[PDB]
Amino acid sequence: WEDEFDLENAVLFEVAWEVANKVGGIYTVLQTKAKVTGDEWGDNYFLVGPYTEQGVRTQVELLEAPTPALKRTLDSMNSKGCKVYFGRWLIEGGPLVVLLDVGASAWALERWKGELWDTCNIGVPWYDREANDAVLFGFLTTWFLGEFLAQSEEKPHVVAHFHEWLAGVGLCLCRARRLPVATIFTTHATLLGRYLCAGAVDFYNNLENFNVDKEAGERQIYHRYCMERAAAHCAHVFTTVSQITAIEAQHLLKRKPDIVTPNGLNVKKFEFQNLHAQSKARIQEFVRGHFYGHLDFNLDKTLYFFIAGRYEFSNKGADVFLEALARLNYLLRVNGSEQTVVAFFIMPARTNNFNVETLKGQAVRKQLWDTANTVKEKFGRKLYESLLVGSLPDMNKMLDKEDFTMMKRAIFATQRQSFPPVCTHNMLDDSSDPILTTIRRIGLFNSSADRVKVIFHPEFLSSTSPLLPVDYEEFVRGCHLGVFPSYYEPWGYTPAECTVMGIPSISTNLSGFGCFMEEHIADPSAYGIYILDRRFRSLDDSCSQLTSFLYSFCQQSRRQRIIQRNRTERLSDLLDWKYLGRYYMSARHMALSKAFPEHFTYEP
Amino acid sequence: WEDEFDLENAVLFEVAWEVANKVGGIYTVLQTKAKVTGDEWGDNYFLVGPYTEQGVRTQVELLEAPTPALKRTLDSMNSKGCKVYFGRWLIEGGPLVVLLDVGASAWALERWKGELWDTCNIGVPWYDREANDAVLFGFLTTWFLGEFLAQSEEKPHVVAHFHEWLAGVGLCLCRARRLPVATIFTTHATLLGRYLCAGAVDFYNNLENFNVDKEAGERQIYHRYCMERAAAHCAHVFTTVSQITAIEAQHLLKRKPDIVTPNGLNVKKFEFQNLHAQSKARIQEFVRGHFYGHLDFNLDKTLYFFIAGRYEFSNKGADVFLEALARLNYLLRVNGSEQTVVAFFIMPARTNNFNVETLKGQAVRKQLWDTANTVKEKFGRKLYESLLVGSLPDMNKMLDKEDFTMMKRAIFATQRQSFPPVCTHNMLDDSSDPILTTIRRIGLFNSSADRVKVIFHPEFLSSTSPLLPVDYEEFVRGCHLGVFPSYYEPWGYTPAECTVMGIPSISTNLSGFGCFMEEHIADPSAYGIYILDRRFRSLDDSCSQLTSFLYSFCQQSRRQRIIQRNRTERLSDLLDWKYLGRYYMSARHMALSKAFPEHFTYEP
Amino acid sequence: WEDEFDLENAVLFEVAWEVANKVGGIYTVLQTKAKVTGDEWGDNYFLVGPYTEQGVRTQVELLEAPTPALKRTLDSMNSKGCKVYFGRWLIEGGPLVVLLDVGASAWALERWKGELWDTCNIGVPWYDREANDAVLFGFLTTWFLGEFLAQSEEKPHVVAHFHEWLAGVGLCLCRARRLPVATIFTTHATLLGRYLCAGAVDFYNNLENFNVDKEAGERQIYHRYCMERAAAHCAHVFTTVSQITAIEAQHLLKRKPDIVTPNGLNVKKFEFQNLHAQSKARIQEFVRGHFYGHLDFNLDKTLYFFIAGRYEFSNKGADVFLEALARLNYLLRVNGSEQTVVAFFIMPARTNNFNVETLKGQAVRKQLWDTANTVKEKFGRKLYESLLVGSLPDMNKMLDKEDFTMMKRAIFATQRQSFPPVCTHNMLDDSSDPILTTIRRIGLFNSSADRVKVIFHPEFLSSTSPLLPVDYEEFVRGCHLGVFPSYYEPWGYTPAECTVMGIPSISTNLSGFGCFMEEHIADPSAYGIYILDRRFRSLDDSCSQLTSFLYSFCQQSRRQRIIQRNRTERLSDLLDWKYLGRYYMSARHMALSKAFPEHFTYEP
């Protein structure tokens, strides 16, 4: 937005446990949003966070505060028993960060807990180190805000935006001390949602039939749920990153969010068919190496699907992907479609080292490539010489005995009897792995009859990997489709990165990204976004619909595939922070309107 | 040298008509020597020169003088009827230049000529614009030096180093006004030598049987010879760039030089074996294009000789090179040596445009190369596919009809009946050209029987030439030998640049570079320098000796050629200004000793 | 089409004067159509043509005929006073060609002319060498067809397809001898159309008010018009390459064509954004060099328009383009649009050599580039060293005096007072040139105020040009729009090449390509084809509409431009011979149906 709003003396503090502390996905959200928030708030934008030795040592450049009230606040809090650091976060925008050492202020924790009893009726056990750190951080942030307001010679308007429950407890203290502060609360994932969905008792179907206190007591996380509910209740403005998480919060936290604030990216034109062509060539080389001695299928009609992210079988919907892969294999075999589908499972697991067959295949492909280049280069040299002489070359003589010997060596190298391995690594738990168990149960063994090959790479893609020396971005740029049929995904960063890079993707309406693109696009499938109806269908229906999506993608010609991909690169403008920051702007404006109705007015 | 000498208040002015005015080879000498002279004289180093609009507009950054005496001098001379600029020459070292507008001070020329009559007994005609400009420049320089000495609150020691006769009239005037200045005179070429050698009356044999005044009167350059002789006689120190020019000056200028100051280069590692390989490949491609339809000789045993420089047939010894080429062709044919020698004559002449045969040959080679690459790439693709399948490839089938069609088109392109042209351009004067006349007289028509091919490129090598888009340096890096059998060459810059770039070369003892390498090397031929004995041999004997040199080079194996080239690349340390500036240092020290014997003492 | 038709014994002869004889644009049509015609007719496809020494020597591989009737025909015609060559044309498909030496059969011309009087009432003057060659070629082709039918042991069905009036006299003779042959006539341009449009008397407006015989008599081409009209009248099937030329033929040749057979291309994926980016970068470099010292405009908002083809001012509509450029310059200036438009006029003319300003600009840009790379490389080296040490670099010290000196030299090089030249060459006729006259009349002098710069390159783009070493292909790949507002263009090969390459283009409804795209596309402007209404508008209205088209293109954003370019890249499937050969197939089928109604039936 380009709204005309008053922020002359207003100051914004964005409180989050992940400021200069990468312990989740909110770190990238804050890092990317810092630029667009700075371009609007100037030097009145601060990032409260926790003090970590590693984070400061690698990311924070300690500075001297720029306003006298800020020096007075830091000095008072440092001489009153705490240790507070002021610095600049070495990211785009270089926002000023106010880091707090929670451990150095632990000596008051017990007394502070008493305060938490006297205002909020919230108690925390001693053994919850994470919750005790959250309590310390919240008290430190509230004390910082109060001291900053006290030391200001002219009292400004403070907007405190707390992210998640870890940073949210201070919000309660901001409301229990009548501080003139506009408090916003953002939940990037409801706390009980992960545990309830992990129970596999139809989390989304029974959202209105849950006993939240009973479930928390079963999980022994009642204090955490209570403090997040208190943060959501107390906040002036309650926002969420998605509509599905908004429903989760309405039914679990018992408050309907005021705005939904989707996560964005700093899209930077990461061309599009040049990078795709090069990456597809590299993926083709890897597939040639892996399937050496079994390359009986056309590689010009091979489609590369992929799924990535954290290795959560049920949550990421990898079982649905595998079942749909088996059904699509049957569909391709019965219909006689000469299409081949190579499905990559890039999901890190506990692995020992690289498989022997996979390394041997890569070495065999390298040897074949070297042999082909050597023979081709000397053939071209002899051909050029013959053409210069003016004679039509005789191919019965342009191969000397050395070429035949080395080609025979290559042919003997390619000889192989076993089938290509499903997994490229040695899994420490072959029996305990859900992906390998499902693959061997459904029958995808990379045989010649199978039209669907499966490659499970249980490690992060790196340029230092001997197998496939390309990182995640270059690898997935050369894939045709990304399938993310997730069940519990509050926003979904892998599908969003896939869409920003221009790859058509399959998401669900149970993910935040899927809901976002469903509500922002008239016909998502035209643009390359396929949304599964996982919220109103049984899992069998979800697998059938995913199979239909995959078969429809396979039945597309090259022309339709290219057109759809082009629409997908069009789509990336929706996911930037330039467009998606207006939701945060609106949330801050409602917070200012609610906390200071006399000075600020908001028109929704 | 690292001599301990006093230059605390001494100032050096290097007077030369070529300062910021490229009208000869002394321009590069001054430009390259400026750095090493600055690294010794600091800010007390100045470069007097003439004012040209182009030279100032592209090379001189006008500045404000750094010493009060210098401002006073410039202001007095500008307010006393002249127009003088002070600037910085935009070269390495950034020396300060004192440019003088000779035309703006022409109003005094007549009166100034009277002064030249009252002190030096030298008269100049009105029609000699060059000599009148020299007189104006000399009077301006003398006035500048006198005013600079007058305005100095503390009188310094001035060393004025004049180059060539154009700047020497200033030396004559400085000596005729008892100015406290140490004057050095350097002649880069004796004035009568060019005319006497152009007469072809055995210039070097009759050096002691010349009437200098009579020859000058015949050439009507008596005033120029008189003023150069006066400059040489008046100078405190007389130097020369070579020993052969030193003999010329001893017999013509009637004064033996005190020191010989060879020209140096700013050698910068321009071990020349990657560059040699690449440039040799490019030259091989050019020779393939030029001789298309006649490539019946082994290109792996082809030796590339070259001669370059100004197009002076007798002076540069191109006739000797051509006669030796004919004799070497006979030797190679009689001895049955399968060696081929391609001799390049890079000597600019008056030409219209590129020859049609040469352009057609380059286009034919490009088409053959494109055809070969296309067939080679698809052959390599099919070969890689066949190897991946695991089958021994069949060359009877990997060539489709398209490849046969395009190779047949290439074969029809290469068809040719005429012989390759000797010259790559269309000469406006075919009859008047000495090189083409000599080639057609001796019988080098690039026929199949001839072992010596001749390519005459009458234009400067540039990267914008469609034929051979490589400049002079890259072209001659890929040549095996450079032949410079010059007759009148005071120093010789082409052989010196050839040696700096590591190419073995043939020079003579009538050139300054040849004398330098002869006296600095125990066995020059071991290092790749072949010195013709052109001073004590008849021209037939010179041609026989050059033929022996060329045949000995041809008879060398690849091993001996590589070893000799390595030694030549060692040799380049002798030609740097780091070593060769000590001669100029010595000359300046003798000038200081002679002009100021009380303050300076010199030990030779 | 995939029609089920009988061609078991049918043989096709495609008679054209341009077979292995490049004297027009029909040569490329036949060369590209040979493949798709062979893929349907097998070895029963022949290409009659004229014998040329150059064409045979570079393109035709003489063979031995494959059918006994063909040997008997060749032997009889060679022993009966003619000389006939049988060969293979070295193109895709390698079609068999029957070349005829028209000169060697000139001895019968007089008698043959008598035959032309006895059957067709057509006379030809002696001075028309082209028409006499046409008569000889037609008689030779008719004799060849008759002898081929006679020597066939089993009489086949012959389909003779004659192209243009040069080959049509053979059609007239074939129809006058009752030969069992199905004759098709294709006109790629009506004969009187060029002369009538060159008269500028509203050729298209007065199509129904022409006296064809009177106009031919005025132009003294009555015999040629008569013979083309006879060929069109006699043919079983009359086809044309366009609907506009079909109207021309209906009103001039007095016969409505049966089918319109558009010209096609062998589209081969010649993606389209990597090439566009690289070519745009090279065009930007050229524009930087040309406008050195005047680069006061944003080059990121510069749009590259171009017009190419034969240098016909009125026919190619270059005057309309220039007037619209002036109007668009006014529109951009008044509206303050910071867009700049560089219009290239790639139209060969009679020029001496390259302009001095243009060469100087290219050299200046090269020097600036070299300076920037040198400074950048040493800066990066020093920066890497400083970062490795662990210190933040000081930019006040990373530039040594050498860098400042060489940057000052670059700055002095860029200094310029004059404006960039409009033409890059030296025109031998500055006064007689219509383009330069129009440019100086309308006021496009590449001044700073002008938003439209004009660069006139009167020479074919080749990689050997020192200015812009890129061919026409790669140069126009990097342009944004091609403007071809032609008045008389029977098909239009430049717009078709432009569209195949993926560039949006402006054509007219008076060109064949424009009519083709108009009738094959619902909204042409969406796909990047802008069709001027030059047939029903006055020239002022045409200029206004072209100005509107250009301004609408300028007002497009980058997103809309990219989308439109993607649609244009889609469009290229319409212009291939795979789709456009079905029109020729239909024409041949109607010819077979008409000539042999008992054996062949056609359903339109």
GROMACS .gro file of C-alpha atoms in nm, chain A residues 374-554:
model
  181
  374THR     CA    1   3.793  -3.830  -2.652
  375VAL     CA    2   3.665  -4.029  -2.950
  376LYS     CA    3   3.450  -3.736  -3.064
  377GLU     CA    4   3.739  -3.489  -3.048
  378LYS     CA    5   3.981  -3.705  -3.244
  379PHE     CA    6   3.705  -3.791  -3.493
  380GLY     CA    7   3.635  -3.421  -3.542
  381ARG     CA    8   4.006  -3.350  -3.588
  382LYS     CA    9   4.039  -3.623  -3.852
  383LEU     CA   10   3.714  -3.512  -4.018
  384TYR     CA   11   3.835  -3.152  -4.040
  385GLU     CA   12   4.165  -3.269  -4.188
  386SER     CA   13   3.987  -3.487  -4.446
  387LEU     CA   14   3.750  -3.205  -4.543
  388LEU     CA   15   4.043  -2.965  -4.580
  389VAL     CA   16   4.216  -3.215  -4.809
  390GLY     CA   17   3.891  -3.235  -5.004
  391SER     CA   18   3.791  -3.598  -4.955
  392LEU     CA   19   3.477  -3.759  -4.821
  393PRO     CA   20   3.594  -3.931  -4.501
  394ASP     CA   21   3.578  -4.308  -4.460
  395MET     CA   22   3.426  -4.396  -4.123
  396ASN     CA   23   3.552  -4.754  -4.152
  397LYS     CA   24   3.901  -4.610  -4.093
  398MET     CA   25   3.860  -4.299  -3.875
  399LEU     CA   26   3.847  -4.523  -3.566
  400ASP     CA   27   4.191  -4.657  -3.481
  401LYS     CA   28   4.240  -4.958  -3.254
  402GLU     CA   29   4.276  -4.734  -2.948
  403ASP     CA   30   3.922  -4.602  -2.991
  404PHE     CA   31   3.780  -4.953  -3.023
  405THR     CA   32   3.972  -5.065  -2.714
  406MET     CA   33   3.851  -4.774  -2.501
  407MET     CA   34   3.491  -4.804  -2.625
  408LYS     CA   35   3.501  -5.176  -2.540
  409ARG     CA   36   3.624  -5.081  -2.194
  410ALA     CA   37   3.329  -4.842  -2.163
  411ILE     CA   38   3.086  -5.112  -2.279
  412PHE     CA   39   3.225  -5.355  -2.021
  413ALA     CA   40   3.189  -5.083  -1.757
  414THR     CA   41   2.819  -5.038  -1.835
  415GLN     CA   42   2.744  -5.409  -1.784
  416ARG     CA   43   2.510  -5.458  -1.489
  417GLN     CA   44   2.268  -5.722  -1.360
  418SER     CA   45   2.109  -5.566  -1.050
  419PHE     CA   46   1.847  -5.291  -1.057
  420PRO     CA   47   1.927  -4.930  -0.963
  421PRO     CA   48   1.900  -4.859  -0.590
  422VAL     CA   49   1.599  -4.666  -0.466
  423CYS     CA   50   1.806  -4.480  -0.206
  424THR     CA   51   2.136  -4.310  -0.286
  425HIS     CA   52   2.263  -4.340   0.074
  426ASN     CA   53   2.303  -4.618   0.329
  427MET     CA   54   2.016  -4.576   0.574
  428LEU     CA   55   2.106  -4.654   0.934
  429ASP     CA   56   1.743  -4.769   0.984
  430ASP     CA   57   1.625  -4.954   0.674
  431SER     CA   58   1.338  -5.118   0.863
  432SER     CA   59   1.232  -4.801   1.047
  433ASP     CA   60   1.225  -4.580   0.736
  434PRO     CA   61   0.866  -4.503   0.627
  435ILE     CA   62   0.962  -4.401   0.273
  436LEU     CA   63   1.159  -4.718   0.194
  437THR     CA   64   0.892  -4.932   0.361
  438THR     CA   65   0.620  -4.771   0.149
  439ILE     CA   66   0.830  -4.806  -0.168
  440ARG     CA   67   0.890  -5.177  -0.111
  441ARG     CA   68   0.524  -5.228  -0.016
  442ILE     CA   69   0.377  -5.058  -0.324
  443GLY     CA   70   0.632  -5.210  -0.562
  444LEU     CA   71   0.848  -4.935  -0.715
  445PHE     CA   72   1.185  -5.107  -0.756
  446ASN     CA   73   1.310  -4.916  -1.064
  447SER     CA   74   1.255  -5.220  -1.284
  448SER     CA   75   1.230  -5.199  -1.662
  449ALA     CA   76   0.853  -5.255  -1.654
  450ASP     CA   77   0.797  -4.970  -1.408
  451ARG     CA   78   0.726  -4.638  -1.576
  452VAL     CA   79   0.795  -4.455  -1.247
  453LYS     CA   80   1.150  -4.455  -1.114
  454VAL     CA   81   1.211  -4.340  -0.756
  455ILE     CA   82   1.532  -4.185  -0.624
  456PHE     CA   83   1.544  -4.114  -0.250
  457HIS     CA   84   1.821  -3.868  -0.161
  458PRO     CA   85   1.819  -3.845   0.222
  459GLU     CA   86   2.052  -3.545   0.245
  460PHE     CA   87   2.054  -3.174   0.168
  461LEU     CA   88   2.155  -3.100  -0.190
  462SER     CA   89   2.498  -2.936  -0.189
  463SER     CA   90   2.753  -2.840  -0.451
  464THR     CA   91   3.009  -3.041  -0.251
  465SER     CA   92   2.816  -3.368  -0.288
  466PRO     CA   93   3.010  -3.601  -0.523
  467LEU     CA   94   2.684  -3.739  -0.668
  468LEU     CA   95   2.501  -3.423  -0.775
  469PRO     CA   96   2.719  -3.114  -0.716
  470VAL     CA   97   2.432  -2.866  -0.743
  471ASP     CA   98   2.251  -2.702  -0.453
  472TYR     CA   99   1.875  -2.700  -0.399
  473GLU     CA  100   1.792  -2.406  -0.627
  474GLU     CA  101   1.976  -2.529  -0.936
  475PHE     CA  102   1.852  -2.884  -0.882
  476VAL     CA  103   1.484  -2.795  -0.857
  477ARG     CA  104   1.504  -2.542  -1.141
  478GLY     CA  105   1.551  -2.839  -1.375
  479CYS     CA  106   1.253  -3.034  -1.243
  480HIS     CA  107   0.917  -3.032  -1.418
  481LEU     CA  108   0.682  -3.048  -1.119
  482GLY     CA  109   0.701  -3.024  -0.742
  483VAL     CA  110   0.450  -3.226  -0.542
  484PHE     CA  111   0.380  -3.103  -0.187
  485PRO     CA  112   0.061  -3.281  -0.073
  486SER     CA  113   0.111  -3.177   0.289
  487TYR     CA  114  -0.145  -3.233   0.564
  488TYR     CA  115  -0.018  -2.994   0.834
  489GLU     CA  116   0.164  -2.699   0.678
  490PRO     CA  117   0.087  -2.361   0.836
  491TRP     CA  118   0.239  -2.165   0.547
  492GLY     CA  119   0.468  -2.388   0.342
  493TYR     CA  120   0.804  -2.248   0.235
  494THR     CA  121   0.913  -2.521  -0.007
  495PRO     CA  122   0.609  -2.475  -0.238
  496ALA     CA  123   0.656  -2.098  -0.223
  497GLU     CA  124   1.024  -2.121  -0.317
  498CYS     CA  125   0.927  -2.363  -0.594
  499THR     CA  126   0.674  -2.114  -0.733
  500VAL     CA  127   0.913  -1.818  -0.703
  501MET     CA  128   1.165  -2.012  -0.912
  502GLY     CA  129   0.898  -2.076  -1.175
  503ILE     CA  130   0.833  -2.450  -1.134
  504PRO     CA  131   0.471  -2.571  -1.147
  505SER     CA  132   0.374  -2.723  -0.816
  506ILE     CA  133   0.110  -2.932  -0.641
  507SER     CA  134  -0.002  -2.802  -0.302
  508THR     CA  135  -0.312  -2.860  -0.089
  509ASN     CA  136  -0.589  -2.652   0.063
  510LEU     CA  137  -0.466  -2.762   0.407
  511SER     CA  138  -0.147  -2.559   0.355
  512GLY     CA  139  -0.124  -2.183   0.386
  513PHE     CA  140   0.043  -2.136   0.049
  514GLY     CA  141  -0.226  -2.348  -0.116
  515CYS     CA  142  -0.505  -2.142   0.038
  516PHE     CA  143  -0.326  -1.821  -0.063
  517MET     CA  144  -0.295  -1.922  -0.428
  518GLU     CA  145  -0.646  -2.070  -0.429
  519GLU     CA  146  -0.795  -1.738  -0.318
  520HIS     CA  147  -0.566  -1.522  -0.536
  521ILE     CA  148  -0.608  -1.708  -0.868
  522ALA     CA  149  -0.921  -1.769  -1.075
  523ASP     CA  150  -0.795  -2.095  -1.232
  524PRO     CA  151  -0.483  -2.208  -1.043
  525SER     CA  152  -0.417  -2.512  -1.262
  526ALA     CA  153  -0.376  -2.284  -1.564
  527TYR     CA  154  -0.082  -2.114  -1.391
  528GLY     CA  155   0.077  -2.439  -1.277
  529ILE     CA  156  -0.062  -2.462  -0.922
  530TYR     CA  157  -0.262  -2.777  -0.852
  531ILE     CA  158  -0.451  -2.765  -0.522
  532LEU     CA  159  -0.556  -3.096  -0.369
  533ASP     CA  160  -0.885  -3.101  -0.179
  534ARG     CA  161  -0.736  -3.269   0.126
  535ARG     CA  162  -0.971  -3.091   0.369
  536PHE     CA  163  -1.303  -3.230   0.241
  537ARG     CA  164  -1.188  -3.567   0.104
  538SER     CA  165  -1.083  -3.899   0.249
  539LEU     CA  166  -0.719  -3.994   0.200
  540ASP     CA  167  -0.815  -4.239  -0.074
  541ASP     CA  168  -0.995  -3.959  -0.258
  542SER     CA  169  -0.689  -3.739  -0.207
  543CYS     CA  170  -0.466  -4.007  -0.362
  544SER     CA  171  -0.708  -4.047  -0.653
  545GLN     CA  172  -0.716  -3.671  -0.715
  546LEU     CA  173  -0.337  -3.649  -0.694
  547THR     CA  174  -0.313  -3.935  -0.943
  548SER     CA  175  -0.548  -3.744  -1.173
  549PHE     CA  176  -0.331  -3.433  -1.138
  550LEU     CA  177  -0.013  -3.626  -1.216
  551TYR     CA  178  -0.171  -3.807  -1.512
  552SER     CA  179  -0.307  -3.481  -1.651
  553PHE     CA  180   0.040  -3.328  -1.622
  554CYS     CA  181   0.190  -3.632  -1.797
   0.00000   0.00000   0.00000
